[PDB]
Structures are given as structure tokens and as C-alpha cells.
């Protein structure tokens, strides 16, 4: 149903991504065991995508858009400049199948995310 | 960005519009370009209710019903409550290069006749 969000750093709290908005982020992808599958920084650029439109895993879409603007209980809003940890259950990520050998079947994913800008 | 082809057969209220995360109720008939029907609300015997804009249905439906997630599109008319439309959905907005055989074949364009009966229950 819903991902888990923890706020490392608060952001302006006025600019929020909306579905179909563009966002730019820095991120860390780790499995629960602490081993890293993807990272923007090591790639060498921040990552820009369209959120809320199924262009990224559902857990990102929910987190970045605050559940498509509906919101949820215990879903803190994420705003420009926010730094957070996102814990995403497999159905909000790559599912029962996974994407082997990159990500195994039924994996929860932990993301360190910083929202640099919206649109 | 691919967009579905939407034709307004009959205008609706022009006031009630679904947004992402809204619920909608619709009557629909789905046919292949050769005119063969593959799915219908009538065959179900009830209209179909779902959440739009969240990847719960094929992308073509999500775009059509939310007017590209509230962004709009070139030549993309808005669909409002009471609208009857025909939606032509290219394979990448439906089921893909693969398909879901035998229900729907590979690389298939889908043509839907839709009526939007309600938004969020009303």
C-alpha cells in the first residue's frame, strides 16, 4: 500500500511536486542488508524524472507526490530541499519477480533521497 | 511522450474532471483495430470503477481520464462526467511489444468506447 518515509532534513515546506511535475534528486539505493545497487552521485549527475506517472517505481511516485496529492497517514510531505529515507516494500518496487541480477526477488529497498528542485 | 488519440463522441458536463488518485466509474467496450471485441463492462454486467492516474489501469486510460495527469497535451481533449469518447491507445500505452497472449496479442493498438458515468462516486 504505502512506503515508509523518514525525514533526515526539512526543506522549504512550500514547494511540492505534483503528478506530472519534473523533479531533480540525489539518491542512494541500498538493499536492507546495506548493499548498494544504484546511486546518483557515483553516476556523477543528479537525476531528473517525471513523478506520479509510472516513470519510476511506485514507491518513488507515492513519496515524491505525497500519494498523488491524496496523502496518507504517516506519509510526511517532501518538499524542495528535504532529505529523506524511503523504505519501499517489494510491491512498490520491483515485486515478487525482482530484476535479477541487479535486484533479487521480493526485496525491500532503502533510498536516501534529496529533492533539489521541482520543475 | 506518446499520447492516446481521443475523440469526443458526446460532450459531458464540462465541469467534472478526474485528477490523479480520484476514483471513476465508466462503461467501456474494448476492440482491436479489426473490430473484434476483447473486453467489455457490459459482459461484466456492471460498470467499472477504479482509481485513475496511479498505474492501476493501462497508461492510455490514466492519460485519457486525467488529461495527462493534469498537464494536458497537444490535441488531447478533456473528458468530463457524462462524456462519450473513443480512445485509440497505441501499444506502448496498453500492453506492450509482448502483449498478454492469448487475451491480447503483441504490439496491439486498442480502441475503446468509453462513457464516464461518475467521478469519486458522483
Amino acid at each position: 500500500e504505502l512506503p515508509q518515509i523518514e525525514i533526515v532534513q526539512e526543506g522549504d515546506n512550500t514547494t511540492f511536486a505534483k503528478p506530472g511535475d519534473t523533479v531533480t534528486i540525489h539518491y542512494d539505493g541500498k538493499l536492507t542488508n546495506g548493499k548498494e545497487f544504484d546511486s546518483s552521485r557515483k553516476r556523477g549527475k543528479p537525476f531528473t524524472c517525471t513523478v506520479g506517472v509510472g516513470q519510476v517505481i511506485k514507491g518513488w511516485d507515492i513519496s515524491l507526490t505525497n500519494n498523488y496529492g491524496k496523502g496518507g497517514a504517516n506519509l510526511p510531505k517532501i518538499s524542495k530541499g528535504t532529505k529523506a529515507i524511503l523504505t519501499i516494500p517489494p510491491n512498490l518496487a520491483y515485486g515478487p519477480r525482482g530484476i535479477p541480477p541487479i535486484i533479487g526477488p521480493n526485496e525491500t529497498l532503502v533510498f536516501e533521497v534529496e529533492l533539489l528542485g521541482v520543475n
Side-chain angles (χ1 to χ4, degrees), chain A residues 1-42 44-109:
Chain A
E1 180 88 280
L2 288 175
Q4 321 205 47
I5 309 184
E6 188 187 57
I7 312 283
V8 174
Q9 176 182 330
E10 293 183 355
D12 66 48
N13 200 35
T14 84
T15 77
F16 299 94
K18 261 173 212 278
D21 282 342
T22 293
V23 301
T24 315
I25 76 148
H26 256 168
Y27 72 85
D28 259 297
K30 296 184 153 131
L31 318 156
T32 55
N33 66 5
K35 280 179 171 93
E36 172 149 316
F37 64 82
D38 183 23
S39 157
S40 69
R41 285 151 169 313
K42 292 140 181 125
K45 181 191 169 62
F47 176 67
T48 85
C49 63
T50 313
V51 288
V53 304
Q55 191 167 120
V56 276
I57 56 162
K58 224 201 154 49
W60 278 28
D61 270 353
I62 297 145
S63 292
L64 278 176
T65 71
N66 194 41
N67 206 24
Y68 307 89
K70 304 328 239 218
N74 290 287
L75 253 216
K77 276 173 149 215
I78 300 193
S79 62
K80 183 182 166 162
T82 310
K83 275 194 233 209
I85 289 119
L86 307 175
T87 290
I88 311 196
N91 282 334
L92 297 190
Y94 295 101
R97 152 168 211 278
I99 39 171
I102 302 165
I103 299 212
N106 250 283
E107 301 271 351
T108 294
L109 308 173

